[PDB]
Amino acid sequence: TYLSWRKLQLSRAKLKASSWTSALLSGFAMVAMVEVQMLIAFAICTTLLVAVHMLALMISTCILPNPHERLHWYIETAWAFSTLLGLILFLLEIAILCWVKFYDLSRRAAWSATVVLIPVMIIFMAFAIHFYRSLVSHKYEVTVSGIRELEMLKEQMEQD
Amino acid sequence: TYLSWRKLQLSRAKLKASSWTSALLSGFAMVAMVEVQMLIAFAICTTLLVAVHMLALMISTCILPNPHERLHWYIETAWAFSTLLGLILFLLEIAILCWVKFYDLSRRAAWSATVVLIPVMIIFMAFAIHFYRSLVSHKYEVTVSGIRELEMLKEQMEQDHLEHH
Amino acid sequence: TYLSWRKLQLSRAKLKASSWTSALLSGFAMVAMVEVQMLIAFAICTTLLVAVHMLALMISTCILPNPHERLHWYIETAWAFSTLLGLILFLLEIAILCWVKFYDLSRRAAWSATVVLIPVMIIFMAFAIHFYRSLVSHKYEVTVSGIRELEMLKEQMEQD
Amino acid sequence: TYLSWRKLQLSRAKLKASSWTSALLSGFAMVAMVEVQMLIAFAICTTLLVAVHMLALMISTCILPNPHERLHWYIETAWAFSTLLGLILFLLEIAILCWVKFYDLSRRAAWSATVVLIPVMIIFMAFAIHFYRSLVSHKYEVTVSGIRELEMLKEQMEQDHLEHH
Amino acid sequence: TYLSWRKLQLSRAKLKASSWTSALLSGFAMVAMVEVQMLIAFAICTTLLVAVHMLALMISTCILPNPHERLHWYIETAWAFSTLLGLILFLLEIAILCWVKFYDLSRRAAWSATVVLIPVMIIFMAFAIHFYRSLVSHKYEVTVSGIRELEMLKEQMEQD
Amino acid sequence: TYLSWRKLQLSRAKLKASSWTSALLSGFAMVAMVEVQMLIAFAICTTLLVAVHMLALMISTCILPNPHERLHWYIETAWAFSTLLGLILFLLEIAILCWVKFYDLSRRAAWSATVVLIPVMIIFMAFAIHFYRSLVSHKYEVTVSGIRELEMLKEQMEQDHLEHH
Ligand SMILES: [Ca+2]
Numbered sequence A, C, E: 001t002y003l004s005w006r007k008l009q010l011s012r013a014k015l016k017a018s019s020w021t022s023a024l025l026s027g028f029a030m031v032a033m034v035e036v037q038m039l040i041a042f043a044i045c046t047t048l049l050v051a052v053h054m055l056a057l058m059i060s061t062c063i064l065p066n067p068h069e070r071l072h073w074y075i076e077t078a079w080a081f082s083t084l085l086g087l088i089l090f091l092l093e094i095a096i097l098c099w100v101k102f103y104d105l106s107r108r109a110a111w112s113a114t115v116v117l118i119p120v121m122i123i124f125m126a127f128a129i130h131f132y133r134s135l136v137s138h139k140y141e142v143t144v145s146g147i148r149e150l151e152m153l154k155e156q157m158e159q160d
Numbered sequence B, D, F: 001t002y003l004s005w006r007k008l009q010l011s012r013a014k015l016k017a018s019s020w021t022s023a024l025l026s027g028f029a030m031v032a033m034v035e036v037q038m039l040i041a042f043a044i045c046t047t048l049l050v051a052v053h054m055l056a057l058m059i060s061t062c063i064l065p066n067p068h069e070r071l072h073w074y075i076e077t078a079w080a081f082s083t084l085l086g087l088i089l090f091l092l093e094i095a096i097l098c099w100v101k102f103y104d105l106s107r108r109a110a111w112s113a114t115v116v117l118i119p120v121m122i123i124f125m126a127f128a129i130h131f132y133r134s135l136v137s138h139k140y141e142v143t144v145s146g147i148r149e150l151e152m153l154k155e156q157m158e159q160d161h162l163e164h165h
């Protein structure tokens, strides 16, 4: 009873927070584009960021009406993946904006900013990979896949 | 009990999230329009986006007071459809904006962006179609359904009144 | 018990969502006016939109402290009516803004936009009428009024 | 039990909605002022609107920790009054803005707008009056009420301390 | 049980509302500064306002993990004090902004606005004093301090 | 029961407030950057502020699905640290902005502002240090902790599968 209650309250706080950030990010970004008015990058990025988020939101329109377990994990992962694509894209977007503001003014600063992004982009890229790998395949293989990837790490910290 | 409780908490998280995003998207889009100040597209899109979203919001003004099951599913669906059209229109809106910001500067970028949207637009359009199809069909079933509930309400006042003497 | 609990939680989600959208719409609209700076229309519209919403909000200041049934339905309908007037006015406002942005630039587009609004404005106008008719009169007459309006529709779908 | 529970959930939805709108209106109005950049009016209004709303917010900082009944009703009323003044000031603020945007361009529109407001302003002013009247009256009752509660708190520590030995 | 439940739900509505307003005020103010671009005042004010609020927010990062009673009242008061400093600073900020907008245009209006602020600033200053006095010292002294300050008032209303 | 309930409601209010402020700060800062349009500082700050906050948000995407205790504390801490860095970066961001708005106009004000920040920055930095120190240490403990939980999950499917015949 406590488990089913906790699971349902988690889907409910996830719903409220998903719609929340998806809409606020999407909006703040659209406004960021009209306020300033590699450029193919800026356009595909803004546009992709808003589309990916609208996807997540719709996944919040449809999880509400809806064995059941396998379908709910596929939808859940599709939501989490669309959302993560949204955070990455929002980051890429701020990179491209430092770029666009600084292009004709200071190249050093712009390049510095887009660069400091790489390690975080790595962590982000990493997780996007786990959710994608989780989407096509079934829980087991990815569960073991995960144990392998973690165990190979257990060997590194000890050596040091 | 757990089922009726979960259903009610789902209409309640759906209410709070619906009003939320409808107002934030609508407001943000209107502001996006005034800030820049093929064009017939931009106007019809902004205006349609805001009208469709206000429709969703009102569906949150009226689900609150509310056999009942068929009528509540129709209304819920009118909400999901208004909401989804709003998402589509918002996406369309950001496309036309890349278009408008980039028109005289770089045609390549705008067209590239407007193109990469197509797979997502496909999924969105698909669902818009299913929801539309659910509405047109029960236009019959529901109207009646609503009559039966309103009648029962007219009858519940008649009984409640017969006891006052 | 479940009924009184559901009614109270509905007044509580309605409170939180009312204040939410009333304030966000009002604000977004005020900002839309200062950012651009038939015109009598634009002014009466912005001004009416913010006033109607502030009304709704105050109805959320006063439902909190408060047979009881008849008074709570009159207040509820006053809130719902002020709120609906707010959504319509927000729509009229975006019409007038396409108008104001496009006036000297492209008349075709502006007129097209204010026009596509009419069927939705019909549905909106319709509901504004039900709430107003509910405000002056008592539940019964409007309940029957509603059955009549719906039954006369039942005859149309069959013929086709 | 249901009554005390409902009362507490009402102070809790009132808290969350108060802070909500106070911050959004205040912020949005400040931004409305800097974006345009009879005038004495515009300044006193923006500044009063933001001060009155910050008052409401603080009343949400202090209701959280809190015979008790009289003091809690006074504070609740100080909140409702600060809140209502904020709504009035926001309305006044949008009027002065139609005024300021339209001044040199079209006098007719601004005056028309500032006029249609009058019935709504009447209702708002009315309530502002009732709440003000509730405050001035119990300035006496409550101060004492607060003393009695603070004393009882001083006494509850004295008893709680008498047992430590 | 009802008491511990109410206390916990109060810390929970305080958390959600604190983060809410702290972030919205901070943001609206930063944006107010870049949109316009005694001045030492404007800078120290904007900067202080955002710092004080970020403090409150972090106090919402740390109250979540955490006799216990004395520590929770010191943290609670630190949060309430940072928050109050934030509201005052937001007000001072709007004063300084009327100032900055009106300086070269109408001195009368600017001075009028910063002036109408004083009585409210008094109430604000008053409360900031109670929370500061509560931070350094223990509950008792401040509790009695409070009874004294209130009782000396009881004598004034009667005379009139 | 009350303890597990309180812990779960704390992760739930922390989730809702985390996503809340992360998105509002990030969006507001990006907009602050485009509106003005030593400089290497401004860019790295805006970009770092938005990246760190998106990190926090994602930590709200992943706490939802989730011995367990050690792994949940590590993740919670990664969240608190990403969140705190975000607050620091936002403060740094408003400093560099006073700097940038005031550079050619009044040097005195900008420097005064950037200076008064130092005590607050001290407290923030301090906590950033404690959280960082909690992370680096358990890099060992947790990875293993996670393995043990994932294994147990691999084992729970194996048992659940052994019964299907
Ligand atoms: Ca601008």
Ligand SMILES: [Zn+2]
Residues within 6 Å of the ligand: none
């Ligand atoms: Zn009779």
Ligand SMILES: [Zn+2]
Residues within 6 Å of the ligand: none
């Ligand atoms: Zn003793």
Ligand SMILES: [Zn+2]
Residues within 6 Å of the ligand: none
């Ligand atoms: Zn087998």
